[PDB]
């Protein structure tokens, strides 16, 4: 789940 990463664009 890339939406948990605050330091990258999840697209």
């Amino acid at each position, epitope marked *: *789940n890339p*939406n*948990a*990463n*605050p*330091n*990258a*664009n*999840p697209n």
Partner: antibody
Amino acid sequence: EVQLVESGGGLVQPGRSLRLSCTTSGFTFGDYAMSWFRQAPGKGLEWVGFIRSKGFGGTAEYAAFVKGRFTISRDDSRSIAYLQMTSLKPEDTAVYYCSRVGVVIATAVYWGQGTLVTVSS
Amino acid sequence: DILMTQTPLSLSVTPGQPASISCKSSQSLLDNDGKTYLYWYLQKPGQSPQLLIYEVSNRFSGVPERFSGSGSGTDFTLKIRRVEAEDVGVYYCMQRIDLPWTFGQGTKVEIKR
């Protein structure tokens, strides 16, 4: 030194709206994600939401119990982050904390002192 | 949602004796990028939370060396080697690998005199 100050809390009638501010100083505010947490009296820590740097699209993520009702915003020119609450219920009573999310340490690292929100008739 | 189970929920430590707190997650905290998104916080009474350990075993700058963390996958441990009065408060584990970010329920540490 990294400084974060929450404000805007107080007693509010159920159903109404309240906007909290996180006023920051001591760093390039725009470069950092900012996060909100809350702690009901006597209870554990709870994540509310976070908003990414505009360098990564500036979008926000929310916990399930606030989705729809709460929106997190940021004003990079003023170095201020916002939590806009709507449709407030008594179970939203908590100290609300804002925090600077690190880059090496990709979690809430620096925390403010919190602001108490009391939702009651 | 990832459940974070801390044991024990309360600890009474004789001063100078070690403490150990366990945190078990319902899913792996190891990500495909190679990092394990497990963090440990302390909230002293009446204070804002403060970070102790990031990514399982890294001490945050200025945290005393008597704090260490270890573990992998779903089982993690925070160790305080010689507990002092300033270590009293509630300890939380937290994961950031999945949304929502979630915390353990908190482990309360007191001095056993």
